[PDB]
Design a protein around this ligand. Structure first.
Ligand SMILES: CC(=O)N[C@@H]1[C@@H](O)[C@H](O[C@@H]2O[C@H](CO)[C@H](O)[C@H](O)[C@H]2O)[C@@H](CO)O[C@@H]1O
Ligand SMILES: CC(=O)N[C@@H]1[C@@H](O)[C@H](O[C@@H]2O[C@H](CO)[C@H](O)[C@H](O)[C@H]2O)[C@@H](CO)O[C@@H]1O
Ligand SMILES: CC(=O)N[C@@H]1[C@@H](O)[C@H](O[C@@H]2O[C@H](CO)[C@H](O)[C@H](O)[C@H]2O)[C@@H](CO)O[C@@H]1O
Ligand SMILES: CC(=O)N[C@@H]1[C@@H](O)[C@H](O[C@@H]2O[C@H](CO)[C@H](O)[C@H](O)[C@H]2O)[C@@H](CO)O[C@@H]1O
Ligand SMILES: CC(=O)N[C@@H]1[C@@H](O)[C@H](O[C@@H]2O[C@H](CO)[C@H](O)[C@H](O)[C@H]2O)[C@@H](CO)O[C@@H]1O
Ligand SMILES: CC(=O)N[C@@H]1[C@@H](O)[C@H](O[C@@H]2O[C@H](CO)[C@H](O)[C@H](O)[C@H]2O)[C@@H](CO)O[C@@H]1O
Lengths: 312, 312, 312, 312, 312, 312
């Protein structure tokens, strides 16, 4: 089931074919049409009005710049445009039909009452028009290019963390710090770095744009639970694999035997790990709130061990 | 080696540049040209005629709507079009030259005899034309947009299943169901759910369109073999990672000692797993059959354990 | 931080919108403009001249075919074009502004002194023009389509290899080669094949084009170190997952007891593994050198074991 | 260091050679001499009077029947006998000289002041006499044949228990209680017996006679501590290995899956184990108290496990 | 409960004090008395006649040489001797009273009807006499010195074998048999000897004399069961620890890789083990049969492993 | 095969029955006879003269005090005694016939030429006599009561050490030495004592008297070999189980993390262990040398581990 925004969220209607966005303004000359994306052109933003009654399950597309609603009809010219009255006419209601395969994140905006589908193309004129809904062409598909949203918070569902793999990794094996006997001091210093992995994968809810940059603590396995490592301050990219460093540092000393050659082996458990999470976002322009569910996954390490053993 | 369809399979010739498909009809006015995809326009489908003799290794592109074959020549006008006689003229044979990098799933359709390459563009006219084969431009590349195929069957090669990782995961650890002694009944109920993973990756054979929706049992590791779990009835998307739930349920009771505090620990082995498979497909319009080889991979769980231990 | 080429490396400036490359020649008629990629058109290659002084942090875009530099101004017509003097005029310096989200691998070429941004479109004329830098449109973004580079060498940083997972896999379990007693010979032959995995992932440095084909040994885990398996001679594709076969073959015989039924179990450790690496490349036309850092990852196997045990 | 009884404990003086006990009575005719043991003849019991002053480290041997003390002199006849005054004369003090090898649990009773040693023989007359202390003969050795003591209590030092060995032992392996699916009940009954071991070994303190019969709980390993199993009510023999039965009984049922063949494997950890202990004894005739330290050792079992696993 | 022989088994009555055996003959002069053991003197053998009726629980001691029965009375002289009629007189019945501690394997032969106990001493005359049963002296104790019995068979209860400990022991670790590559032959020879242990401990039934020499196979652990190793042909001594050698020999060759340094590690599991058993014996003079239950225990080894691994 | 001393070793001939030793002197009156042991009476020591020629396999018993040899004949009186000429007469040669069962460490001294066996008794006169060799009585058995020997050295065959059992034992588990973060010092002190075991068991060679006290280092398992722990300075008793203390002491400190609660777990491997050995002894009076082979066995511990782990 594709994600359809609620009434207070704004978006751009990007065409698969034209690779351009629909615009609706009060001037210049042409009131509605297509244009290359310009994140600041209020012109290019719309929100939806959820149909009710006999329109339940349908939607009206409202211009943020004009407040007017889009329409699509086949008899009267022009076949498409704007109009007042938030869905006053049957011409303002559309059915959202998700595509398949390469068009799975796209959809047709079909207006039932007239059996017409919106068109967004650059090869034929008018670029923004409609077509008899029964003959499906690729240039009738649209995808949501949502407004800039800010990631306010990431909350992991730690109780459900899970370890997918685990192999011990010896950080500092070599350790032949010795003497003959009755010394008094032998200190060890551990400083090893492992390149870790991080990926925040979409599961459900609001469709955060792939690549969106943000910061958050990342999961860590303690000994019997998962915890959030707030130290990691790297910049992540939504839905993409990121890498970050994890350095293990430790200082310990050993010496109090009849005569030994102290040995220290620092070891950690490394492997793949994933944890569910919810992200809270809000509109930068409005503050409108939404959530997104996801699964975080990455190569990590845990259970740092220091084993001391004497030799003679 | 790119996948070239056999003689009975239909497809659309999508251009890298124009992002449009070639069409060949008997009318209206222009007989051949470019058009946005329309899965129902017979107009846009072609199949290949495998060259033989001195043409072995070359192909003729036959219109499904017209039966006519495409041609490409540089002296006589028009330089491209249709013509009867399934490869009667040397102008009907083409060499398929796979591209590299971003064009690896695309190819040029070069007609040797004339040293000309087909062209599919929208920036210059004619949109469907040809060019002296020696000067390679991006708008000379095409990719196969195969006909809608149905996935009739998935057959796993279970003998070759393989476990990539494995870590024990305790589903229900806590279990302090007690009394002092000589009770008579202490029953346990286990109900834990794990989010699993599923991906059907292409290996060879017919190139199933990424995203194609279908249903099939998914692999499972028994104790010494792999088996197909037919219960999982989720809808998969070819070549993409899907998730699904696996719930473990169990009821067992323990009590017959001198005086105990029965403890139950339910545990499973979880980790990554993959298994080879063959998919059998057939043309929805013709029933023409083909196969696709692939490797299925996913996070799974297995070997559910229930350990009972008394305490006093 | 996006990768900006040094002064001696050539590239094409591909537009996000137009999906076309900028060209600068001495003739025919129009000197600069847009064109579909043609890897042999010297016309389409440029290199950068690193600004210094008050221009430090800015760049001039030099035509490889003409030696002339690009410019962008808003008063005098034409607003864009070529000109001698490697950055003689303030009009030749540009600021490279990386985009975000879907435009993260793209950037604007803004000329500060005039507050103008280059434009690359096919929907409006002139196709190659500029726009008041303050109004950002999608057709103002460009990405680097670097010159054909050759991968001369792959050097792994073996000391940092790491095992992400590990599960024992018994290749040949069944082995009931017997007799009663005092025989004299019982030989075993092992021949098992496992499909392995290989991926060379970009980490930093020169951005090798995804898909680039090349050959190199692949990492292998010995017993206490990682080593390069030079036998694997498959063709890899940069930044993509490849598969390859690994066959284990072995012949051993056992017999010298009071009366036994020799059993042989061949086993290997399989799991995921990754190792850092540096790739050395050079321009095919110039020999200009660069490097790329990356992490190699794949499903592998190691520690082949043969265990013999008698039965009676 | 041999165990010398305190002043209130009674004993018999058994001779190595004569294999007979010393007696001291008021009548019949001969007042002191040798006799076969008769546990009821008060005649044969003596206790010691710890010398003090210049006699510190020496002892007087007091008759329980007569109260008189033994003496040994070489000039005046008879050379040995009884006499009043609890050590009034220098002739009443003896030095206890432990033997070696086969005489390690025996000792000479040498009277320094006169350089004479007591004699207990049956081959020459007088049977009970003395000899010039400088010429050591075997018939000058004695051992303590203590009075009947009762073992009132055994207290183990559980904190110091120790596991010497441990191997898992599967009690009930076979378990193929099945059906096809959706049954509802499958109960299991475990009843297995293991022959255990028990030995109470002397360490220090009062020398309990080997073989002495008594009853006490025996050590058991819980999961993280040792505990006393009070159920075992077998009769032990001090300082000797005893065996006893341990039966494990358990009843548990399992069934609540999509279709399984429930399997149950009952397992225990068996091995050698030992624990220190103190025994409290008291004179049956007097109630005089003493203690004995010892180490208990035996083959035991612990950590009974029940593992349930489904099959299909 | 002490072991009392059935009616057909012969024995000598050895006295604790006298350390001599009772004899009953028809001549010379003294008919009954004491004598140093002489295994061939029929004179010294007796068997028992189980009392019945009011004598149930009592026994008559019958001379094997004379057929006459022993008697004990206090009025008429002599107080002890022989007499016809297998228990005709009340004087022929005795109660067997086991001693404690050092006398636990000894017993008094008390004749109730007269309140008299048999006496066996060498310090007073008559050496063989009796005493008022109420005054217990050490020289009233006897032990059974059974007739020479032959151990016809040892049958182990293998199903109940048990492993008390287990630690892996590498027989032949070192193994660096190599070459560079493509050799063709590398054979290994294993010959290691371990000193094993063997003890047949009495549990119940006939009391086989400690030290009795005999031969039998000894237990061995296969892989899932215990088996009898019939190869071990050492001479055992009943109830005593014996040692014996176990040599592991094996010849195996390995070579068929791209280039290796074959390594072989031969390993075994060693530890303590015990198994119950029954011994079948019979009188050498009569063939009278009996059985003895026991537990066999010893340090053993099992599960010989040969692991081959290549190096480069 | 019983141990027969070589020609230069002295011993006493102790009788089973008489429990007395044979003596041969030049005066007083009776030249040969029996006597209670007196370790200083040269009178009681003899050595053997190995027969050769037709006497090979027989021995003469030579008096150390007199140099004369023992004899045994049945016609001429006295039947036994001394005589010059180290075996001059056939009467001086004896066959040593080991007994069985309770007489396995005893033997008859039979003089073939006359068919007579030596006798050692106290119940009949003469106490030291002989008897017609064909009628075997218990008082014809003798055992060797060797001269006082000194244990000069114990040499273990470390290469053959063997671990019979092994279970980890945590000495100091509890360890919650903490703070919040950035402290700087946290030191640990380990001091735990384990009661160990020691037994030197006879295997072959000279029969060292049971109980003989001596001192020697005891075996210890390092990590890959056995070594002698020379610290243990306890007094051992040949052929008997001894106990001794082993204390593990260690001081180590840990602290250098972002914020932790350092935990330390000290652990050791404990279990049963045995090692072969040879003992070198020599006569205290002569210095005559001999050796004894044996197996040392005991409960020990090894591989002390210190594991440090942080908590938060
Ligand atoms: C002004 C008007 O109504 N024009 C229409 C054309 O747009 C229409 O062309 C097609 O429209 C579809 C839209 O999905 C595709 O863009 C297709 O490529 C076009 O051919 C034609 C009928 O086909 O009718 C009028 O001319
Ligand atoms: C009608 C005709 O023959 N026209 C051709 C042009 O198409 C041709 O233009 C180029 O064609 C290639 C095809 O690969 C690219 O589209 C390129 O961008 C075009 O410039 C020119 C020669 O270049 O010749 C005629 O005009
Ligand atoms: C010749 C000239 O200066 N023309 C310009 C137009 O290009 C310009 O149009 C826009 O340009 C931007 C470039 O980022 C986009 O392509 C946008 O879609 C166009 O509308 C207009 C002003 O908008 O001004 C002149 O006509
Ligand atoms: C009455 C008296 O004084 N008699 C002694 C003997 O007892 C003594 O004999 C020895 O005594 C020792 C005691 O340790 C042993 O029993 C030894 O076998 C005896 O020979 C002799 C001197 O030896 O003197 C008196 O006769
Ligand atoms: C001929 C006769 O009846 N003599 C008895 C003695 O034997 C008896 O002596 C004791 O017998 C017991 C037997 O258990 C012990 O051997 C003890 O040492 C002896 O003293 C005495 C009474 O005591 O009576 C007669 O003399
Ligand atoms: C002086 C002499 O020759 N006396 C012998 C007795 O010793 C002998 O007695 C037996 O000797 C054996 C020795 O093994 C046992 O001690 C047995 O108990 C005695 O009976 C008898 C014959 O038996 O002959 C002479 O008297």
């Amino acid at each position: 089931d594709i994600y359809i925004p609620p009434e207070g969220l704004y978006f751009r209607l990007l065409g698969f074919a034209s690779r351009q966005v629909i615009f609706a303004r009060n001037s210049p000359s042409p009131d509605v049409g297509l244009s290359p994306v310009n994140d600041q052109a209020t012109d290019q933003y719309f929100s939806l009005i959820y149909g009710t009654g006999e329109h339940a399950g349908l939607y009206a597309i409202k211009s943020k710049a004009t407040g007017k609603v889009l329409f699509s009809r086949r008899p009267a010219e022009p076949y498409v445009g704007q109009i007042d009255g938030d869905g006053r006419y049957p011409d303002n209601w559309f059915k959202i039909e998700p595509g398949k395969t390469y068009l799975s994140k796209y959809f047709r905006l079909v207006q039932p009452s007239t059996g017409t589908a919106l068109v967004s193309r650059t090869h034929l004129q008018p670029y923004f028009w409609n077509h008899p809904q029964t003959e499906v062409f690729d240039d009738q598909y649209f995808t949501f290019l949502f407004e800039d949203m800010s990631i306010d918070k990431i909350e992991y569902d730690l109780k459900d963390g899970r370890i997918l793999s685990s192999t011990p990794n010896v950080l500092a094996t070599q350790t032949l710090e010795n003497t003959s006997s009755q010394t008094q001091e032998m200190s060890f210093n551990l400083s090893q770095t492992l390149t870790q992995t991080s990926t925040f994968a979409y599961t459900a809810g609001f469709t955060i744009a792939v690549g969106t940059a943000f910061k958050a603590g990342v999961p860590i396995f303690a000994e019997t639970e998962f915890k959030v490592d707030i130290s990691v301050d790297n910049q992540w990219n939504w839905g993409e694999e990121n890498t970050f460093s994890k350095t293990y540092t430790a200082t310990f000393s050993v010496r109090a035997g009849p005569g030994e050659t102290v040995k220290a082996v620092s070891t950690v458990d490394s492997g793949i790990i994933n944890v569910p999470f919810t992200a809270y976002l809000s509109s930068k322009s409005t503050g409108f709130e939404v959530t997104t569910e996801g699964i975080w996954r990455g190569v990590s390490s845990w259970d740092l061990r220091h084993t001391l053993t004497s030799v003679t």
